[PDB]
Design a protein around this ligand. Sequence first.
Ligand code: 4F8
Length: 145
Amino acid sequence: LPPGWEKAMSRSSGRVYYFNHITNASQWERPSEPARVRCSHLLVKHSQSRRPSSWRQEKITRTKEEALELINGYIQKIKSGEEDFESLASQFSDCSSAKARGDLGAFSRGQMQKPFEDASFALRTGEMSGPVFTDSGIHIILRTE
Ligand SMILES: O=C(O)c1nc(-c2ccccc2)[nH]c1C(=O)O
């Protein structure tokens, strides 16, 4: 299979599903290099973040495990269609790019933290990552171009 993708088996149900270890995406359907990609993201910061402060909150005190729970609820809502990505990003992302629906503009390799970079370049146009961990906190990344 395509890059980072391994087949796995559901604990709840027993059907196979696919997992991507670079992006942390998982999906049921079988899955399916650019100089540049364009991504949006939703960042949730925690107490061990490189900069534990955001436009949302002067001192970020939530723990990493609590940050991960928030990320997972936003991923559930985005995948069920209850909320869309841009709207959760605008309200709840700890990055100042929240003001632009999460949009970061296009970027190439060499520019982002490697785990964010690697995730962005492994996603396909249109695809969303699972929780992606960097020194900033925890990201959900949407590749738009
Ligand atoms: O300080 C931080 O740690 C931070 N890191 C980021 C970020 C942006 C693009 C890709 C990955 C992380 N945004 C912020 C921020 O507060 O606004």
